Structures are given as C-alpha cells and as structure tokens.
Amino acid sequence: SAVNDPLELLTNKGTHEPSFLSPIWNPIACGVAGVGAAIFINWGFRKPVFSGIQKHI
Amino acid sequence: ISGKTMRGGPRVPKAAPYPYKTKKYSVFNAIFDKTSKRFDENSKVICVEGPIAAGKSKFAKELAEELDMEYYPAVDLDLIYINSYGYDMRKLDPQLPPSCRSYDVRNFCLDPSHDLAAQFQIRMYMLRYSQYIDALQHVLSTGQGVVLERSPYSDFVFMEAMFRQGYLSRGARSVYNELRQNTIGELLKPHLVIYLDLPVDAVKKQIKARNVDYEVQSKVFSDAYLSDLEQLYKQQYLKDISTHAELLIYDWTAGGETEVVVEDIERIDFNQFEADIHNKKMLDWRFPLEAEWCEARIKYCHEKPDLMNYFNVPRFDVPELVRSADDGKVWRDVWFNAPGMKYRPGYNADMGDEGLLTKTKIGINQGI
Ligand SMILES: Nc1nc2c(ncn2[C@H]2C[C@H](O)[C@@H](COP(=O)(O)OP(=O)(O)OP(=O)(O)O)O2)c(=O)[nH]1
Ligand SMILES: CCCCCCCCCCCCCC
C-alpha cells in the first residue's frame, strides 16, 4: 500500500482473528464477580463462605 | 384492664396475632396489616417493681396468669454468657485477659470494688433495653400486654446506689448518664407500675429467706445500700414515672395475695386520660391515626438494630470501660473461636446444625 486511504484503514478486512478470551472473558469475569459478591455477603453476615449455594448459583 | 374472672373466661384476641418473630414488619407491610386492629383494654405494659428481695418473680408470674398477659422476667447475664447452644462462656476465663474476664452478679457480690462491675451495670441496662423492645414488639404486633419484672427506666437507681457506696467513679457515672440520655428517649413509658414497698431491714430478712451463698457471704447488702435504693426509688424514680404511669404502691412485709392486686387494677379508669390530647398521663401511648400506630410499630420492629446501634458512643477518658488493644485481640481470638459462636447462631456446623448447604435464612432482630 503506497497510500494511507482512510477507507482502507477503517474497513475490517477480516485478517484480525479474535483471541481465545474474546467471546468468553466478560461472562466468566461477571460470574466470578457474582460468586465473590455472594461469598462477601455470606462473610459479612457471619455465615460459612460456601453455606448458601443457591445465592452463589 | 379486665381480669380473667370479669371477662368470663380466657382472653380472646380482637384479631389475628402477627408473627413478629418470623415475618418482618416494614413500611410496605404496613398497608395490609394495621396495628390498632388488635388493641384492647388488656394491651397495656405493666411493670412490677421493688427492692432486691421482694418476691417479684412469683407475683409477676401470677399477675401474668390472672390478667392473661405475657410474663417477662428480669434479664440476667446468662443471656450472653450462655449462648443459643447452651455453652456457658464463664469457662473461657483462663485464656482471657484479667481485664476481659467474665463478670456476673455473683462476681459483683464477691468483689464489689472491681472495675468491670461498672461495665456490668452498663451491660445490665443494655440487657433491659434488649427486653423492652421485646416488650414493645409484643404489645404492638399481637395486641396482648406484657408484664416486666424490671424496667430500663429502673436501672439508673442501681448506678447511683453503686456510686454513693463508692463502687463507681465520676467517670462511669457520666458515661452511664450519657448512654441514658442517648437511649431512653426512644422508648415508650409503661402504662402501669406496681411498687412493692418494703423496709430496709425486712429485705435483709428476705435475704435469709433465699439462703443463696453469694448473697449472704457478700458485703453489698448492708443497711446503707438498701436505704440508698429505697431513697433513690421513692424520691426520684417513682415520682418521675407517676407523671405518666398509674403508680400502685403496696406493703409486702407479709406474704401477700395477687388477687386483691388484680382487683385494684379494674377500679382504675384508663379512659379519663383520653379527654385531653396533651395529658401527661398516657402521653407516649396515644396515637391519633392508624398510620401513627403503624409508624410506632415500624420503629419498634424494623428499627431494633437502630436502637441497639444508638449505644455506640465514644468515651475514652475513663480507664474502667476501655479495653486494651492487645487484650481485645486476645479476647476476640478466644471468644469468637469458642464453640457455639464461631459463626452466626443459625449456621454453626460444630454444634450439630444440619442442612447448611441450602439454607439462606436469617433471624429478624438477631444478634450476630
Ligand atoms: N449490681 C447490680 N445488681 C443488680 C442489679 N439489678 C439486680 N441486681 C441484683 C441484686 C441482687 O443480687 C439480685 C436481686 O434481683 P432482683 O432485685 O431483680 O430480684 P430477685 O432476682 O431477687 O427476684 P425476686 O424479687 O426475689 O422475685 O439482683 C443491677 O442493676 N446491678
Ligand atoms: C458463547 C457462550 C458463552 C457462555 C459463557 C461463558 C462460559 C461460562 C462458564 C462458567 C463461568 C463461571 C464459573 C464459576
């Protein structure tokens, strides 16, 4: 490419393969955040950490 | 307040009693359930009173049986030293520091001049507070009145009795006065009080009617101390309460009988104080609307952690009520690692509780 065309700069040709964590990172991080939030709830109410697994699930 | 005999039988409720120990009453629960649909002439707070030894427990139980009321005995320190699993925490004192050791009523009687005794007096007031809301949860939510063996209003006289005898300093008196000014204004004054008047010597004779060892080998039960309680009661406390509650004073030198004490209650007209809306008698217990009744029931059911968190005041100038930080950490690692209080009392696997894997319920107004 002897010129830097902005149309050619912005058009997704498809040569960028997404990563392994690209479709899966946000649901597993939000699930870990939810499990940790339920753990933190059970810790602050002086329960066992893995006592109520209904809240965890 | 009609008794069992004039009513023709057992008391019938005016409506269904609210499960206040199981269902949480809040603002959104106040629409469907109303407070004043259960109130009647029997829905009044009666506090029996008196000196150290006056037969308050048997007389209060008989008054609860005859008037169809709930009996509430005087709170002792076995409510927190013995937890919900029955483990007494008085056996933890070798591991605990000497400023963090167990101190109960018999420890006051054997050692009056100890520092933590002042703490004990403050602790007793909190325990009385911890039953009085439990009194006011019973009157407002179910509609059945209660009888109290002693009152949180009736506990500053014990503080001044220790102070004039020399068991408390000026600092502990100022601290307990500050907690009383912080906390007593949120309570409703009782409807009726019964004081069992006794002389200073005869109570000592009633000490020999009990024959317990720690109250006969002690030092506090003397002539000046019981006279100090009698003077404090009859010159400050009953005169302060008689502007709100109908006071009944009986002489209890003899054995007495609870039926004439019942029959003096129905001779009192409780509707004569409702003619004036600014009357000092029954002022805290009158409510012009159903929404004010539900407002008080919300304050006394959903805001019991509020009234228990009003005790969090800072006072560091005294050296009797300040726990050392190394002693505090040692006390935490002994007391909270003990069997029966490692976790919340529902979820304790060490004491045989089963089904913890699917349990997510907690107690309403429960000490953690
Ligand atoms: N230090 C202290 N002791 C108290 C306090 N309240 C009660 N006591 C002690 C004093 C006596 O040892 C004992 C007497 O209890 P009460 O006077 O409440 O009556 P008692 O338990 O004897 O019941 P009774 O009247 O006999 O039915 O309790 C208090 O606030 N401080
Ligand atoms: C494309 C589908 C994605 C589904 C979500 C990602 C996997 C989640 C696995 C479980 C994560 C939480 C474990 C505690």
Side-chain angles (χ1 to χ4, degrees), chain A residues 23-24 27-28 31 35:
Chain A
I24 74 161
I28 69 181
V35 164

Side-chain angles (χ1 to χ4, degrees), chain B residues 3-167:
Chain B
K4 205 191 273 306
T5 302
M6 293 177 71
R7 215 191 291 106
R11 194 199 53 113
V12 289
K14 267 190 63 201
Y18 200 77
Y20 62 96
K21 288 157 302 202
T22 312
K23 187 167 193 132
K24 158 196 71 73
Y25 187 72
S26 61
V27 181
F28 294 97
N29 284 115
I31 297 89
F32 321 108
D33 288 282
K34 297 304 201 328
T35 300
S36 171
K37 76 193 269 196
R38 273 162 283 250
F39 264 65
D40 213 27
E41 202 86 0
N42 296 115
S43 50
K44 291 181 176 65
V45 178
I46 292 181
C47 171
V48 306
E49 293 210 20
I52 301 299
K56 301 187 293 296
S57 305
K58 184 172 70 69
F59 161 68
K61 207 144 175 50
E62 287 187 80
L63 191 71
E65 282 207 285
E66 289 275 351
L67 277 170
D68 291 331
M69 293 180 183
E70 185 86 11
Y71 170 56
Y72 278 151
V75 287
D76 46 352
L77 264 68
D78 292 17
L79 286 153
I80 63 175
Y81 280 139
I82 297 170
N83 45 9
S84 88
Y85 291 116
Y87 189 94
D88 49 351
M89 293 271 178
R90 257 173 307 269
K91 319 209 273 177
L92 273 195
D93 59 356
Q95 317 165 43
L96 290 175
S99 83
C100 299
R101 273 192 164 99
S102 80
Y103 204 92
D104 54 354
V105 160
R106 49 166 301 271
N107 275 302
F108 163 74
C109 287
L110 294 174
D111 197 17
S113 309
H114 202 273
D115 291 331
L116 305 183
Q119 173 189 359
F120 159 66
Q121 166 59 42
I122 295 178
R123 177 175 282 174
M124 272 276 297
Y125 173 79
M126 293 177 70
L127 285 188
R128 294 190 189 179
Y129 206 84
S130 180
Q131 83 170 357
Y132 196 80
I133 314 172
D134 278 337
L136 297 191
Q137 283 182 198
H138 206 118
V139 189
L140 297 167
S141 283
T142 49
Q144 163 187 29
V146 290
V147 62
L148 295 173
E149 202 196 272
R150 264 183 204 278
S151 284
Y153 302 91
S154 160
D155 208 23
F156 83 109
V157 286
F158 277 96
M159 173 267 302
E160 294 256 15
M162 311 171 177
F163 167 69
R164 274 211 281 281
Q165 215 60 43
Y167 306 138

Side-chain angles (χ1 to χ4, degrees), chain B residues 188-289:
Chain B
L188 303 180
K189 305 179 104 159
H191 276 278
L192 188 153
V193 285
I194 295 176
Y195 181 66
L196 320 178
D197 203 7
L198 270 170
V200 59
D201 62 357
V203 175
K204 294 173 69 61
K205 183 210 309 298
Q206 296 266 30
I207 292 297
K208 295 176 175 62
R210 278 205 279 175
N211 219 327
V212 297
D213 47 352
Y214 65 97
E215 296 200 14
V216 66
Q217 77 192 353
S218 180
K219 185 52 211 163
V220 288
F221 303 123
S222 51
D223 302 288
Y225 177 74
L226 300 191
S227 279
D228 270 317
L229 278 73
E230 275 283 298
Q231 165 197 359
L232 269 159
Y233 263 90
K234 300 199 298 178
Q235 293 323 297
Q236 281 157 44
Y237 171 48
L238 286 185
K239 287 173 75 173
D240 283 350
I241 291 299
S242 72
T243 80
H244 190 277
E246 280 272 40
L247 171 79
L248 283 72
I249 301 184
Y250 300 85
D251 187 27
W252 269 66
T253 44
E257 181 210 12
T258 187
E259 261 282 349
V260 292
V261 191
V262 159
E263 281 146 353
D264 302 323
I265 292 179
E266 295 92 8
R267 304 213 278 127
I268 302 177
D269 218 352
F270 282 97
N271 291 318
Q272 67 175 78
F273 318 119
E274 307 301 281
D276 205 350
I277 207 72
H278 290 347
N279 207 348
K280 274 275 179 284
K281 307 289 283 290
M282 312 325 188
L283 171 63
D284 282 87
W285 271 97
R286 63 189 62 209
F287 293 108
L289 297 175

Side-chain angles (χ1 to χ4, degrees), chain A residues 42 44-55, chain B residues 336 341-344 347 356-360 362 368:
Chain A
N42 288 338
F45 275 125
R46 268 174 66 86
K47 309 181 190 179
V49 160
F50 305 127
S51 76
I53 63 164
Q54 297 169 346
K55 271 188 174 182
Chain B
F336 285 99
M341 293 177 71
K342 187 174 172 65
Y343 296 122
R344 149 183 296 280
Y347 305 94
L356 294 175
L357 202 43
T358 78
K359 195 144 56 85
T360 43
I362 45 180
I368 208 170

Side-chain angles (χ1 to χ4, degrees), chain A residues 19-44:
Chain A
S19 51
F20 178 73
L21 281 182
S22 178
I24 74 161
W25 167 251
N26 268 327
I28 69 181
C30 288
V32 159
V35 164
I39 279 171
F40 192 73
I41 283 164
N42 288 338
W43 178 47

